[PDB]
């Protein structure tokens, strides 16, 4: 399927144990997609002071359209030293590995895969 319904655990930035997906734009997008498929991907809502507490390159989920079954359609955009790889809509948050942190909420998305 070109899209997959996911419910992503929303994590507090200070709880996150693994603060990024790797060391290159290509690796972080690769690992993010693998963790999304394996159900091991969390979401941190971007506010003042969040991104400096996480590791670059960043992987964002961005709104790709204006929401089937309650699931917002999203795609992945990576960022490294202020340059983005991909073009999309409003940021829903930054993806991180999930390794058992307790979420505060869930974010239903339809991921362009």
**Cβ atoms within 10 A of the Cβ of 14, count?**
9
Which residues are CB-neighbours of 70 under 8 A, at least 6 positions away?
108
- Choosing among 1.25.40, 2.60.40, 2.30.30, 1.10.760, the CATH entry for 3-112 is 2.30.30
Q: Which residues contact 25 (CB under 8 A, 6 or more apart)?
A: 57, 78, 80, 85
d(CA 67, CA 56): 29
Cα 91 to Cα 102: distance, rounded to the nearest angstrom: 22
Q: What resolution in Å is listed for this PDB structure?
A: 1.6
Give the separation between CA 108 and CA 73, rounded to whole angstroms: 9
CB 95, CB 32: distance < 8 Å: yes
Relative to beta strand 83-85, strand 91-97 is unpaired
Q: Give which of 5, 37, 35 is closest to 20, Cα–Cα.
A: 35
- Report the C-alpha gap between 25 and 27 in whole angstroms: 6
Give the start-to-end residue ranges of the domains of the chain: 3-112
């Amino acid at each position: 399927k070109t899209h997959v319904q996911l419910s992503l655990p929303v994590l507090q930035v200070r709880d996150v144990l693994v603060r990024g997906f790797g060391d290159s734009v290509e690796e972080v997008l690769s690992e993010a997609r693998q963790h999304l498929k394996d159900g091991t991907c969390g979401l941190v809502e971007v506010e003042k002071g969040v991104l400096p507490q996480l590791e670059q390159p960043y992987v964002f989920i961005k709104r790709s359209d204006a929401a089937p079954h309650g699931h917002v359609m999203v795609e992945l955009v990576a960022e490294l030293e202020g340059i983005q790889y991909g073009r999309s809509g409003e940021t829903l948050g930054v993806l991180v590995p999930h390794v058992g942190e307790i979420p505060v909420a869930y974010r239903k998305v339809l991921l362009r895969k």
